[PDB]
Amino acid sequence: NAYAAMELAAEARREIHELWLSAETALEREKRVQQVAALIEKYKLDPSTPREADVSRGLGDAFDRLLLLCLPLGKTDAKGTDNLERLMHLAGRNGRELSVRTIQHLFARTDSFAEALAVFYTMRRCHVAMNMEAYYSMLYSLQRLEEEGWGQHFRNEYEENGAPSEQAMDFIVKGISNALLPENKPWLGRVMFQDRNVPDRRYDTRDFDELDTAWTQRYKSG
Amino acid sequence: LMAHSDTKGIPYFKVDNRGHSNGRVPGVNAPFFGEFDQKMMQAMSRPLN
Amino acid sequence: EKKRIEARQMMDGRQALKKKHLDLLREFHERQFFFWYERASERLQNMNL
Amino acid sequence: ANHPNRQSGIQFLTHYNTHQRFRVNKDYIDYMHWGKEQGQARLPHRHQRVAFDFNDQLHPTRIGYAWFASQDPTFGH
Amino acid sequence: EERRHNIHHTHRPTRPLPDFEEVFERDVEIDGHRFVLRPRWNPRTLQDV
Amino acid sequence: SIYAHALSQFAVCRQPWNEYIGLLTKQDSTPYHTEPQEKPAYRGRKQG
Amino acid sequence: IFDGPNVGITPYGGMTRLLARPETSLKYPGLAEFVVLTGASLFAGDALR
Amino acid sequence: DASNNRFFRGYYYGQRELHQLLGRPHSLEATNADGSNDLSTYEANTSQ
Amino acid sequence: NPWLRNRQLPHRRQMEGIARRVCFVLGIPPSEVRIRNLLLPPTYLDKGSIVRLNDIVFRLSNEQSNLLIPWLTNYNKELDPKDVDYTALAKTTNEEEWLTL
Amino acid sequence: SEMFRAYVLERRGATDVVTHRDAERAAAWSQQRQREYDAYCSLKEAPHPRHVYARLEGCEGKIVSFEFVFEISCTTTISRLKSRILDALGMPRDRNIDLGWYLPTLDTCPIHSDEELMQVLHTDPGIEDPKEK
Amino acid sequence: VFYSFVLVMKPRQRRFTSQALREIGVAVYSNGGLIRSITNEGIMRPYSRFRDADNTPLTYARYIILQLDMGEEEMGKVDKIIREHQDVLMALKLNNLERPVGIRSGNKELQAAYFPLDTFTRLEEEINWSPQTSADIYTQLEMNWKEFSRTRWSSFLRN
Amino acid sequence: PVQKKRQEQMLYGVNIPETRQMKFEEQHPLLAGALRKLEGQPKGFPFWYRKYPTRRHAYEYRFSIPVEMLDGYNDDVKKALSKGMMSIQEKQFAQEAMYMERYAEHD
């Protein structure tokens, strides 16, 4: 019975991986977003779906990479924030807790500020109990947004000049002036005596894949 | 009753900095190797060197 | 003179350290502020009713 | 000392700011309800003692078993 | 980490630093046995000695 | 330790002395255990 | 642990003698080669027997 | 002075005042022969 | 300060940071960037330090260096015993950060 | 606060009685939640079709992979999985085999029981290189 | 609550009770304070006869509960306003409602050190339990807990 | 007359100086930027936390509740946490915190 649900869930994750492994410029923001919405509406990933015949149960680990496949929110509508909160809601039912690794890359996926707030708010609606990981990952994401802004500014003014200013240089050295959770004092961003900065930079698909493949190799050998 | 909340407690939230005040402690934080000295015999001895 | 240069070496060290302690205390307060907000939000939600 | 309020004696082995126990203004003792486990009601409580006997245990180190994994598997708390 | 980021530990150093890739040979096969990681001996085999 | 596993298979655990000495046959054993009552303490020079 | 052909050296510490006593050849023939070639740990029971 | 003469290194009247004035940390039983645990800020930051 | 050295050379997080910041500004490809440290003796400068300053930081083959800097051959200064260890630094745990710098 | 002001006075049989006005409603609620719990648990026992990696502990690296369906409703299931593992390893089915869970945290557990095994399946989503399909 | 009152009042014709309560209420608004709840109760038989302004002892009296948010300065004014009104037999005042007896004694509070906002949000009814309360509310409480914690953020982040 | 003026100025109410809003905007222009986008809208993330480093720093409402945290709630609640509703002891602590902040070398 539910064995059927799991089978159709196998085809599901097959095509999720199919579009995840693409990760090409041929997949544009608009295209990725509407392709994701297409998958969700194909396989009935709404919370309205009953407990049995819930397709999201049998997606191992394809759930998180489907989840952060949503994240940069295209420019059409504010509809986008809903895809996300559908997925999370299902997790809420199913019992699978969100890994901090997953939400860290989730914030690392964010393009603008309003989107970062969009995410945090969304997992507020989704009954996620906020931890220090939540807060610090968010702050990190804001910080890298500003760092990215300034990086854009200085490369920009380097382009119309041809040699860097001293502002460009000491920006390169000490980073953002008066940052929250800064580099020069690393002991601040730490939670449970482990440093928390994943979200301070962008990640490709192959980065994510690199980490878990590393894990897999370590199992297959050691 | 008055304080009962959906947010889990301090331990889940890991609000606290520091930790044990002595840093890494074989009994409390880190693992413990070797032998227990229950009497203080090794704990006060005089360096012969 | 040698005694004094190493005396102020240790002094500078200590003053640096209590700067670091200061940063740690600030961020401790920040942390327990976030937690405070998690509880207080939750109570005021109820008081809105 | 036969004076009342001086009965607590001269103890040096306390942690207070006077070696004369009866001038100490912090912890006033209770002669009727105290001293089941410590002997006399004058003497310091089990957890505040700064001097230790030969065959008596000394203070527990507070935690606030996972870390004994290298030890005897049966070794309890 | 030190080998990558510190010029003073790599190039003509005071005291030498070991190289992982030089000490170990990766992925070795010897007479039916598969070794993930095996160190480098100049007479590599018991036959070669 | 990246590699040492060869030894790990014929390697030997350390033996359970705590419960072995616990479960030794004892000559004070009682079918039902009673905790001893409280012993006389020293209440000071006037009380004894 | 009498090892060190694993670090590329011959064992030291004289325990070689103990392993070569005619007693050891009686009780555990072959054990000497086992422990000297293969780095291998002996324990209390083995040192008693 | 305080190094060759035992009467100078008497703490509680001569040397206490001197250390209060110069701004060294001081106490009854101290590390330095005279009254003082450590150098003052001026003495640490200035080669005399 | 032997106390204040342990911090002085940058945390790995700072090197990540500087690397990708240069990548933003100069437009250099993040694939190939090699960011390195060089820390010189506190009160003076030995042969070792100057050689690895000439050879690595600037790329100078022996003949163009001997051309440009004749006196390096005669310059023999080496680390004093007191000053040898400036390079080796204290390794401190993350649960220990409240105690030592 | 509006809960505590919700008591009420009814006459049952011949006698006066104080009841909650909302009590039955809360009973419906709690009953429904119980039925959802039942759904959830019964559904954790439902057939779980997962891909099995099993690494034999020892100096000889061998890793067995096969597709296994776990039916955790009617011990026998663990022994089924162990029988299968041994079938692939090339060993008799009478080997005494200790199964263990390799955690994503690089820790390890024993698995002594089926009800535990179910929990392992539910708790670990799996960690997979998607390139490999 | 910030403040509460129990007001034992003389059982008069309804228009009079309504006038008197309007007077107390307006006396609270003018002084820049709020009314959380004005709760009415019936005409009860107390354990002590009360005399009214007529010095005629009374067997029955109407009970009325006030719950207020004020400043402590200007509740002096409201106090001697209420106690000086002719239709109020007795008024007892609870100021203990923000720090009641059962909290902040030798770290009884887990995960916080005296969070004041716990008992301020609440009304008097849940700080001090009424006699009719039985084990039944232990049920309702949690359906009002869980339910609440589900809808709160979603309701708040709407606007 | 001076001290009298100090107590009359404590009694009716205190205020946070716009000095703090200013240095908040110059030091952490990003956070202030965010709060500047979000005015009047209920916030689920307290961006304003840098503006109030300590518990004691927020005196404008009871129980150390920062101003911008009251955005999404009832106006009745807003009046119930106002200065007018403080006890006298709370008011003293308010004046003390304000002055302590104006003369303090760090937070």
UniProtKB/TrEMBL annotation, chain D:
This is Enoyl-CoA hydratase/isomerase domain-containing protein. It comes from Trypanosoma brucei brucei (strain 927/4 GUTat10.1).
From TrEMBL, chain F:
It comes from the Eukaryota. This is Mitochondrial ribosomal protein S18. The lineage of its organism: Eukaryota, Discoba, Euglenozoa, Kinetoplastea, Metakinetoplastina.
UniProtKB/TrEMBL annotation, chain I:
The gene is Tb06.26G9.580. The chain holds residues 307 to 407 of 407 of the full protein. This is Uncharacterized protein. It comes from Trypanosoma brucei brucei (strain 927/4 GUTat10.1). GO terms for cellular component: cytoplasm; mitochondrial small ribosomal subunit. It comes from the Eukaryota.
Automatic annotation (TrEMBL), chain L:
It comes from the Eukaryota. This is Uncharacterized protein. It comes from Trypanosoma brucei brucei (strain 927/4 GUTat10.1). The chain holds residues 109 to 215 of 429 of the full protein.
